[PDB]
Amino acid sequence: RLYYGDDEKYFRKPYNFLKYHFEALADTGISSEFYDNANDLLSKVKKDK
C-alpha cells in the first residue's frame, strides 16, 4: 500500500490567535527590458592646390 499518513492533519490554535487561515497562494512577476544603441560617424575633407 502506498498511502498518505494522517499525522498532523490538524494543529491546536493558541488562544492569542484569532485566526490562522491556511491558504496556498502564489504570485510571480517578471519584467525584462533591453535597450542597445550604437552610432557611428565619419567626416573627411581634402583641400589641395
Partner 1 sequence: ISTIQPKANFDAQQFAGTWLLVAVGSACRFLQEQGHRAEATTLHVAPQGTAMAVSTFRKLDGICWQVRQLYGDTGVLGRFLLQARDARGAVHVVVAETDYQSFAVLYLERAGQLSVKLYARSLPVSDSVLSGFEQRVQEAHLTEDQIFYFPKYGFCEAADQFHVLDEV
Binding stretches for partner 1 (CB under 8 A) = 1-3
Residue closer to partner 1 (CB basis): 7 or 36: 7
CB 18 within 8 A of CB 25: no
The nearer residue to partner 1, 5 or 29, going by C-beta atoms, is 5
In whole angstroms, give the CA distance from residue 28 to residue 21: 21
Please report how close the Cβ of residue 1 comes to partner 1 at its closest, in angstroms: 4
- Rounded to whole angstroms, how far apart are CA atoms 11 and 19? 12
Closer of 2 and 38 to partner 1 (Cβ): 2
